[PDB]
């Protein structure tokens, strides 16, 4: 189960909201946590997502407009965040507390997805742009792109932000922006001129960019998407 | 003595750059984000170097898209990268084919470490 | 005919006579930079941050530093990220070092991508095996590399594709400035971060092989174009004034546009170093990096001797050919 | 005074490049001795200017060749016109679609009588 | 959306106000063209033989429009005649020229554009020449007929000089790469290129081309394209790899191209460059003639950029009506 | 016949050519007068053709090398050329004298066109490039390349000079130099953005250069290309 996953984080706010949704205007703004809001087929890619993506983003609230982040929290002139702020009094009051950083992020202000999409498939996948090797067509290990891996909540598919953009146009575009997927390591190096922005391996290691290679012993993360039902 | 050096090594890589052929299969799309982004995706996928003043015309092309904010627009939207590789093939054509080494001495002449745009990859093997 | 093809292979000779001294020409150039870097060589030999490294015991800096304090692996390595940049004041390294995260901070960096694939090895189940480089190190020497660990490789780095300041010492990138719709500047802003980076003059240039910086490849690549602004409310205040990413000298950090960071901020132990104040030290980096300027012009040189034979030998099968046509014609 | 000017003069040129269509029909085949005199030709098949890094390219491209004595070697045997006139469309949307004006703008801050470039023809 | 469409139209509204604040801008500084240029007339009007021999070529048109110079739109159409534009100091290297270039080239028509062309002559069904053509009409209005074949140049569609020039100097003279040897120096000989030979009238030096080009990169480039000028014939001979396309002797005989030569009995031409005349007060009055040509191109610039901004603004005019049209119906 | 139109032009020196040839070295070096070389099918196409080389250059003496031109004439220290010259002792004894310049064409120091021929045709026409307007095919009035019109003495087409190059390749090829023919003076006109080097228009003017018009009462030419038998 994967509330059980969001809970075992206890430093977290995940786990915080999660603990609200088991039992004020902050979950009304707030749309939900990144896990929750994702779902992917098989088991493996789904973990090589989640380390691609670490435990702090894919641990990350997700609102909608700017004033819902001012309502997340509270400065005061000293500069520090006491616990006058909204999750801050939230966890005194209920429970566990928020010691480490996590991520908020808007709707609003990201960076939406302007480009064309697939017409008739469903979930309105990107038409995002296959690379080619000189020969013929694509590299040999090419499964496709992560942002399209994504299956999702048909209820976030359209008008979730105030433009009418849908939810993969702007959350999912920003965490996985054009990033292919391939099924072994040396079908990946092979394939490393073809690359723009990241390559994930199906067996093993990732590389965020283009000259940084991760390796070594495989740091996981505990929470992943959930399956699709 | 400075002077005679530039142009004999100016001939010398001329007639190299003009004794490398292009090559027959030209089918491939790299996705890319700036100018000098292809052309290193496309020295790394054709094991041929490009010339010196392709590369400085590459360079000033990718300088010129600074300052208005079309940075943020992703260079793989507005041109298809198919296009683009075409029109460096073509122009990488025209400067080995058509150019004196002389005016290309001067232009090494006019500024040192003209060795950045130089590649150092061989055609052979 | 006969009398075209006679001037043919009379200028075929001619220009293989040139392609001699073409060659001969550079052995003496090459010669001469021998003769100039023994010269300096000579002149040259004539004249904490570890214990923050050695903290993570897990990750790989940690084994790098241990071993420094006792191959071929070690050579490739230029070095780690933490011990490359230098800052002068205290809080803006902490907060740097707490924006690029401890992950990105202990990477290893080598020259070129061989040097990367010497590091790990992989069997066809895809394990990490301890018969990998820094794996059999760190085990023949004591504890092992359970954390992953960043490689990055100075070749594949895409390098800043713009102009720098060119008077400038240090070589410090001038990148536009962030503009409101009105004429005038964000009044948070400092500095992009890149620029903040106080860099060892060894490394300043030729460091790539295309005689690229370090600034432009390695800490372009890690600082890409983000702010640092004073206070928080600067921060907010200039939202869409930002591109990249933000970063106030106050408290958090923003990756994105929209991604905002905030609450408790979680510390990175690991800093960049404070610079020293010495300038005998200066004197003696000023004489390295004048070393290594004179070593890349002479790398270059050998690459254009490469080129020169590669022409003379197919100069030379052409001109046998061509003597065996004209003989049997 | 210069400054704003010749930012205004540089952000108007560009927008108008910018709307210029590229044309639908490219099946032709100039004889041309030199880069400029297909560029002018083909000013004149077609109803369209060029841009003003384009015509600045091709005057260096042509000033490129001068010297060594391929100058009496007639260009259009190096180059089939075919090839020569897909680069110079493919160069000048380029030059129409991605580039800045502030770029331009210091371009024509360098020299002045910048006009030698910009075509007074208009579709 | 809706409130994207509205935002939307809100934003064509500030570009369609921009541009008419660049127009605004463009009339300012025409009309700042416009006080500069009639300051420069007033100033002007303040500061305020060849002829025979073209007249003896009396079949040719050039006498026909010198004789009219004695006494409409051709004669605002047309330049002048070659042998006008041109002026060189010494006697001997100007006959030299004028043997060179012949009578028929020597004694061309220059005008502006290709329809200043279409003016001169009219063609028939058949397309013979009919006389109801502007030049024949006129020089029959006037006295003798044009029976010899005589020559037109359009300066618009002249292939321009692409290369460089020399900076430091005035009469602007072009630089070219000046011959070698195989191995040593250059040929021995060498006095100069040709072009850079003829003196320009300094009211001709810039923005005569509607580009801005002047009359040596265009006209006298033509005529003279790149060939050398020796003192004597043996080192003109002695001098055979060296040339690119014409050489000339200064003693002797001319060559064409590079297997031609020529020998013979040299016919001479009757008509010659004349030699230029260095007076410092029609100096300083053709300075200001050029600093009127450089004002008057300048202001032909600014207006074809008020073309191009009116054509912009009423593209924007079209697009925001019809953006509006359609949200109103939605 | 031609030669009477050789032989009208008395001031030249090829009716004292012609007139050796009715009744030394000059003429063995000599291959002979332009005239006498080319023949044209048609009669116009002739006319017009002379009238674009002009009297001068249709009257030219051809010779092999360099040294048949200094055969041809000599020069004292003067400069000037006296009658002890070739062709001056030899009309002088013979006839008329030579008071006009006239060409002299060395087939040696000619610029030979290095251009693939066609395989088939005979007389070995050049295989040069033909324009096309940007919808089509070739231009409306385009009748052809004027240096592939001319008809040849087939004992010309080979081993003419030293290296092995034709007499098209080398005189015509420098005396029409890839310039286009034309029916309509309109054709001429409409097409004048593909013409490279000249055009020639079948009824009427003819341009040398690009922006060279050449109009007015058309001056004729006596001596015309004769007919091929």
């Known amino acids: 189960d994967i509330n059980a996953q969001i809970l075992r984080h206890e430093n977290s706010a995940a786990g915080v909201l999660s603990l609200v949704e088991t039992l004020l205007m902050l979950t009304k703004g707030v749309v939900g946590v990144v896990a929750k809001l994702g779902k992917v087929n098989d088991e493996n890619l789904s973990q090589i997502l989640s380390n691609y993506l670490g435990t702090r983003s894919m641990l990350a609230v997700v609102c ?45 202000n990201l960076r939406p997805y302007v480009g064309q999409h697939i017409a008739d498939d469903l979930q309105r996948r990107l038409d995002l742009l296959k690379p080619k090797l000189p020969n013929g067509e694509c590299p040999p290990g090419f499964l496709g792109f992560a942002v399209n891996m994504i299956q ?11 433009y009418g953009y849908g939810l993969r146009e702007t959350l999912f575009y920003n965490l996985f922006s ?8 040396a079908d990946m190096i092979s ?39 | 003595a400075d002077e005679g050096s530039l142009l004999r090594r100016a001939e010398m890589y001329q007639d190299y750059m003009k004794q490398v052929p292009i090559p027959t299969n030209r089918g491939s799309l790299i996705p ?94």
Request: glycine letters at 6%; charged letters at 20%; one cysteine or more.
């Open chain 1, 64 to 108: 909608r407009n700017y004033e819902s982040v001012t309502a997340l929290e509270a400065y005061d002139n000293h500069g520090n965040i006491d616990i006058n702020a909204g999750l801050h009094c939230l966890g005194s009051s209920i429970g566990r507390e928020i010691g480490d950083s996590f991520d908020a992020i808007c709707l609003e």
């Open chain 1, 152 to 162: 999702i909540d048909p209820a976030y598919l359209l008008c979730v932000t105030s």
């Open chain 1, 178 to 185: 054009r990033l292919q997927v391939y099924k072994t390591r």
């Open chain 1, 191 to 229: 394939a490393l001129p073809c690359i723009s922005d990241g390559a994930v391996s199906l067996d093993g290691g990732i590389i965020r960019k283009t000259g940084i290679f991760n390796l070594g012993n495989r740091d996981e993360v505990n929470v992943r998407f959930a399956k699709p039902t």
């Open chain 2, 32 to 125: 890319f984000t700036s100018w000098v982004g292809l052309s290193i995706s496309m020295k790394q996928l054709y094991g041929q170097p490009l010339h010196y003043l392709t590369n400085v015309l590459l360079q000033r092309w990718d300088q010129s898209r600074f300052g208005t904010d079309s940075e943020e627009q992703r260079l793989d939207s507005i041109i298809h990268p198919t296009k683009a590789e075409a029109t460096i093939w073509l122009v990488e054509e025209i400067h080995r084919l058509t150019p004196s080494h002389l005016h290309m001495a001067l232009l090494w002449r006019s500024d040192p470490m003209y060795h950045s745009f130089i590649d150092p990859i061989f055609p052979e093997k």
